[PDB]
Design a binder for this molecule. Structure first.
Ligand code: NAG
Ligand code: NAG
Ligand code: GLU
Ligand code: GLU
Ligand code: MG
Ligand code: MG
Ligand code: MG
Lengths: 439, 438
C-alpha cells in the first residue's frame, strides 16, 4: 500500500481516508474505492504543509524537525488496523493523527495503547471515547456527542416536534449518538416512532426497505433524526429518488452530513428542508494559498496526487480516460475547503506543542533531543498532551479536559432552495455550551 | 513478559484461555490480571495440551506430523487478548487459533487474525454478530449463535406465562447482542420489558449497588429478571443482594454465562435460589478427568501456571504460610468445566482441517511436505469451512455457510435440595425451535 513520507528527527503518524471504503465485493481483499478530496488529498496536504510551517517556526520545537508517515484509512476498520500495524513494527512512530470515524478510531486506539502511542483525532465525536480506562492514549480536538445529541434534542424542541423517526449509521458514531438522543428525547417528552439502523455501504434494496419503513410512520413522523454518516444520508436521498419521495421527510442530521455537497449533489430536491449540525470550524486562510498552487507534474511528495488530479478532471496525465489533461487545469475552479480542516491542523499542532513541552521539561537547557528523549517515552508524551494549552490556527484556545476531550460549538444549517434549480447550505442558528440560538 | 505454555511440533497452533481473572479497576492500564482460574484456565490449558498428545498418538489423524502449541493468557480481557495475539503474529508461524471465550474479546482477536489469514475457532463465543463472514471471515465456532439462546430464553418466559420482566445484560458484545435479540423477539411475542439495564463485570461494589437499587424500584411488578449476562455479572448482583438483604424477592433467568457454574453461586446460594439458567449441551469428557486428576505440581512443568494454581487452590506453599501436604489431590471437590467438550472439538476441528489439507497437498506422503511449507492460511480456511467429523461426545461437528455449528440447550434450575443444600437441577431442554419442560 502507498505511503507519504516526510523525513525528520521525530516521525508523527497519520491515517486519512484517501479513498472510499471497499465495496461488498472487494472487502476481504481490502481493495479501496475512489480517491477522495476534502477527506483525503486535502487532509494529506494539510498534514505535510503544517509540518513545514512548524519546522519553519523557531518558536516551536527549535532545532528539531518533524517528519511524518501518512497512511490510507479508507474509512475502514480492517484497512486502518492493517495500516496501524505498519506503524508499530516497532524509526518509531511517536503519535498518530486520526482516523476520521469513531469506530475506526476505536479499533486504531485498541492497537496503539498497547505501544503507549498517543492518538489525537480531529473528527471522531463518539461519547464512548471519553472513557480513559478503555481509551487512555486517545484525545481529540472536537467535543463529544453528549453535546451534539443535546443540540439535536434542542432543535426538535424549538420547532415543536413531539413525534419523530430515528435513523443511525451502524457502528459506534451513530449507535452511541442515537443512544444519547434516544435517552435525552425521552426525558424531554419526545416520542420516537421507530429506531432504524443501516450500514453506509448497504445496497439500494436495504435503503429502499428503510425508506418504505419510514413512510409507514407518515404523516405523523415526517421528521427523521439522523445520527448518520454523510453516505447514509445520501443513501436515504437516492432511495427517495427511486421511490419518488421528494418532499415527504425533513432530515435532521448530525455532523456526518453538516454542509457536505457530496452528500446532496445530484439529489437536491429530496434533501431540501434538511437541517444539519456542523462543528464550528473556520477556514484556514493559508491552506488554500498553498493547496491551489499544487501541480501534478511537481507534487511528487504526495503519492496519491496524480491519481487524484486525473480523477478530478477526468483526464490522463502525459507522465482509463478518453481525454488528456489540459495545461490550464487548476483547482481554483470549484474549490471547496474541507469543513473540518481547522480541526486537522489543530490536531497536528496539539501533537507538536505536546512534544515541544516535553522537550522543555526533559531537556531544560538543551537545543534539540537530549538523551532523556532518546527515545521518546509515550507515557510522558501523553502526560504532556493531556495538559494541552495553546492558541489554535484560528485564534481559539485549545485545551483538553481530564477525559481528553475539547470544548467546541455547533453551527446549524438549513438546506434551502435559493431560487429556481439552485440549492445551498444556509447558516440558520448555533449551539454552544447548552444555549441554542436560532435566526 | 507474560508466561506461555509451549509444546513443540511441525505445526504450531495458538490458543487463548483465561488463566487469570480480568484486571480489576484499576490494574487495567498496566494490564495486570488477577487470581488464577481453574475451569476457565488451568483445565482448558490442560485439555489443549492433552488433546494434542492424543492426536499425536492417533495414527489415523495427521500421521508423521507433530502438533505443537502456543497457549496464551487472555485474562478474559480485550486488551490483554490483543496484546497476546500480537505475539502470535510477530511473525515457527502460528497457523490457527483456539479461543478466546468471550464474544467481544473474540471480535478484537479476529480483527487482528483476519489480516494475517489465521483461522480462529471458538468454543464459547456465542454472539450473532460473529455469523457475519464479511466482517469475521477467518472465524468459526463449535457452538450455536445466540439467535437460538435468545429465542429459547423468550420461550422460557412464555412457558411460565410471564408478561412483564426486567432485563440486565453485561456490557460487551455478548450481552448487548443477545439482549437485543431477546428484546426484538419478546416485543413481537407480546412480552413487556419494564426497563433494560447494563453493567461491566469488573464494575465496583458501588456500581452493582446502584443497579440493584434500580431493579428494586422496578419491583414488585418485575420480579423476573432476564440476564444475558456473564457469570461475574450474575455474581455481582448476588453480592449486591447480600449487602442489601433483598434476597428472595428476585428470580434470575440467566444465559450461558451463568449456566451450571458453581463459582457464580458459591457463598451466595440463598440469594440465587430459584434461578433458571440456560446451558449449552456438552457432556463431560471421560478421558479428560483421567488425565487431569493424575497431575502433580512437582512434575507438571510444561504448564507454567500449574504451581501457582496448586498453591492457590489449596492455600498452601510448595517446598521448592503453611506447607503443602503430599496427600492433597484434585479428586477432592473436582468439577469439570461445563464447556470442556467444546474446547476439545474446536482443537479437533483445527486438527481435521490441517489433515484434510495434508491429504490433497501431500497425497502419497506421511508428514509435512514442501507444498505445505509454509501453510497457506487461506487454504486452511477453505478446509476448515468444510469441517465434518465425529465429536468427542459422539455428535457430528459441522460448520454452516456462516462458520457456525448446531447445538442445543439444557435448562437448569438452581434450588435447595434440603436444609442448606443447593444444586443445579436439569429441568428441561431446548432443541431447534422446540422447548420442553416437565
Ligand atoms: C492556559 O490555560 C489556563 C486555563 O486552564 C489559563 O489559566 C492560563 O492562563 C493559560 N496559559 C498561560 C500561559 O498562562
Ligand atoms: C460428513 O461426512 C460423512 C463421512 O465422510 C458423510 O457420511 C456425511 O454424509 C457428511 N455430511 C455432510 C453434511 O457433509
Ligand atoms: N463525527 C463522526 C464522523 C463524521 C465525519 O467527519 O464525516 C464520527 O465520530 O465517526
Ligand atoms: N457465551 C458467552 C461466554 C459465556 C461463558 O462461556 O462464560 C460469549 O459468547 O461471550
Ligand atoms: Mg520548528
Ligand atoms: Mg497423529
Ligand atoms: Mg462463525
Amino acid at each position: 500500500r502507498v505511503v507519504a513520507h516526510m523525513p525528520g528527527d521525530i516521525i508523527i503518524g497519520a491515517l486519512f481516508s484517501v479513498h472510499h471504503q471497499p465495496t461488498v465485493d472487494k472487502v476481504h481483499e481490502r481493495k479501496c474505492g475512489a480517491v477522495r478530496e476534502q477527506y483525503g488529498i486535502q487532509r494529506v496536504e494539510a498534514m505535510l504543509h503544517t509540518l513545514e510551517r512548524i519546522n519553519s517556526d523557531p518558536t516551536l520545537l527549535p532545532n528539531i524537525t518533524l517528519g511524518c508517515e501518512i497512511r490510507d484509512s479508507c474509512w475502514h476498520s480492517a484497512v486502518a488496523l492493517e495500516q496501524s500495524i505498519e506503524f508499530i513494527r516497532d524509526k518509531p512512530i511517536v503519535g498518530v493523527i486520526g482516523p476520521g470515524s469513531s469506530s475506526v478510531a476505536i479499533q486504531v486506539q485498541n492497537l496503539l495503547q498497547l505501544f503507549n502511542i498517543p492518538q489525537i483525532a480531529y473528527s471522531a465525536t463518539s461519547m464512548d471515547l471519553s472513557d480513559k480506562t478503555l481509551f487512555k492514549y486517545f484525545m481529540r480536538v472536537v467535543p463529544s456527542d453528549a453535546q451534539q445529541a443535546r443540540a439535536m434534542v434542542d432543535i426538535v424542541k424549538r420547532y415543536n416536534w413531539t413525534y419523530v423517526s430515528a435513523v443511525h449509521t451502524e457502528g459506534n458514531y451513530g449507535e452511541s449518538g442515537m443512544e444519547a438522543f434516544k435517552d435525552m428525547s425521552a426525558k424531554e417528552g419526545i416520542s420516537i416512532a421507530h429506531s432504524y439502523k443501516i450500514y453506509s455501504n448497504a445496497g439500494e434494496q436495504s435503503f429502499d426497505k428503510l425508506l418504505k419503513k419510514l413512510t409507514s410512520h407518515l404523516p405523523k413522523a415526517r421528521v427523521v433524526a439522523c445520527f448518520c454518516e454523510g453516505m447514509t444520508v445520501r443513501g436515504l436521498l437516492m432511495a427517495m429518488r427511486r421511490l419518488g419521495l421528494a418532499g415527504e421527510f425533513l432530515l435532521l442530521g448530525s455532523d456526518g452530513w453538516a454542509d457536505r455537497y457530496d452528500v446532496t449533489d445530484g439529489y437536491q430536491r429530496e434533501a431540501v428542508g434538511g437541517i444539519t449540525i456542523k462543528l464550528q470550524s473556520p477556514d484556514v486562510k493559508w491552506f488554500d494559498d498553498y493547496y491551489l498552487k499544487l501541480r501534478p507534474e511537481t507534487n511528487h511528495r504526495n503519492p496519491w496526487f496524480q491519481e487524484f488530479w486525473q480523477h478530478r478532471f477526468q483526464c490522463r496525465l502525459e507522465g482509463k480516460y478518453n481525454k488528456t489533461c489540459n495545461s490550464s487545469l487548476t483547482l481554483k475552479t470549484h474549490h471547496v475547503q474541507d469543513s473540518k480542516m481547522g480541526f486537522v491542523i489543530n490536531a497536528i499542532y496539539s501533537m507538536a506543542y505536546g512534544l515541544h513541552n516535553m522537550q522543555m521539561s526533559l531537556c531544560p537547557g538543551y537545543a534539540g533531543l537530549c538523551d532523556a528523549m532518546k527515545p521518546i517515552d509515550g507515557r510522558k508524551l501523553l502526560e504532556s498532551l493531556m495538559k494541552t494549552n495553546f492558541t489554535g490556527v484560528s485564534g481559539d484556545t485549545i485545551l483538553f479536559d481530564e477525559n481528553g476531550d475539547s470544548p467546541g460549538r455547533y453551527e446549524i444549517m438549513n438546506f434551502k432552495e435559493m431560487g429556481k434549480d439552485y440549492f445551498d447550505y444556509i447558516n440558520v442558528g448555533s449551539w454552544d455550551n447548552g444555549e441554542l440560538k436560532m435566526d
